[PDB]
């Protein structure tokens, strides 16, 4: 019941744009791994190398974590293989945290409003 973890701005397509990501109704007192994950390869769900940033939302599911949106970088497929891309300007990169359950409910496709 909220926008969850989302970057302040919208045009995430900014040379490693540093902003704050507020997570409303997110990990209600829980914690996860914040990062921009998305299909990097041919529909292959690959996370960025900077998508590794522990996160924790207050009991009020308030995960106000700040990080940089490094659209450019070496992506890695979730399957097990690594891609790279270098520039995640093609596939919308979703900035969010991952659950320890094996799901990707959180993640805002940042890049362009
Ligand atoms: C699908 O979208 C995202 C979004 C964010 C923020 C993500 C943040 C970190 C990630 O490592 C992933 C990811 O690996 O997605 C997999 C994972 O095993 C759980 C469900 C998916 O199958 C991810 C996927």
UniProtKB/Swiss-Prot annotation:
GO molecular-function terms, A-Z: DNA binding
Q: Which cysteines are joined by disulfide bonds?
A: 37-47, 88-93
UniProt keyword annotations, A-Z: Antibiotic, Antimicrobial, Disulfide bond, DNA-binding, Signal
Keyword Disulfide bond attached: yes
Q: Is DNA-binding a UniProt keyword of this protein?
A: yes
**A GO biological process this protein is involved in?**
defense response to bacterium
Q: What does this protein do?
A: NCS has antibiotic activity (for Gram-positive bacteria) and antitumor activity (for certain mouse tumors). NCS binds non-covalently to a chromophore which is the cytotoxic and mutagenic component of the antibiotic. The chromophore binds to DNA as a weak intercalator and causes single- and double-strand breaks.
Family assignment?
Belongs to the neocarzinostatin family.
Q: What is the protein named?
A: Neocarzinostatin
Q: Summarize which stretch of the complete protein this chain spans.
A: 35 to 147 of 147
């Amino acid at each position: 019941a909220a926008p969850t973890a989302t970057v302040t701005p919208s045009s995430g397509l900014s040379d490693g744009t540093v902003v704050k990501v507020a997570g409303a109704g997110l990990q209600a007192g829980t914690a996860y791994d914040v990062g921009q994950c998305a299909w990097v390869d041919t529909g292959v769900l690959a996370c960025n190398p900077a998508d590794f940033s522990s996160v924790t939302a207050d009991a009020n599911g308030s995960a106000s974590t700040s990080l940089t949106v490094r659209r450019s970088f070496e992506g890695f497929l979730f399957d097990g293989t690594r891609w790279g891309t270098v520039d995640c300007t093609t596939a919308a990169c979703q900035v969010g945290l991952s659950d320890a359950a094996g799901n990707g409910p959180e993640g805002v496709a940042i890049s362009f409003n």
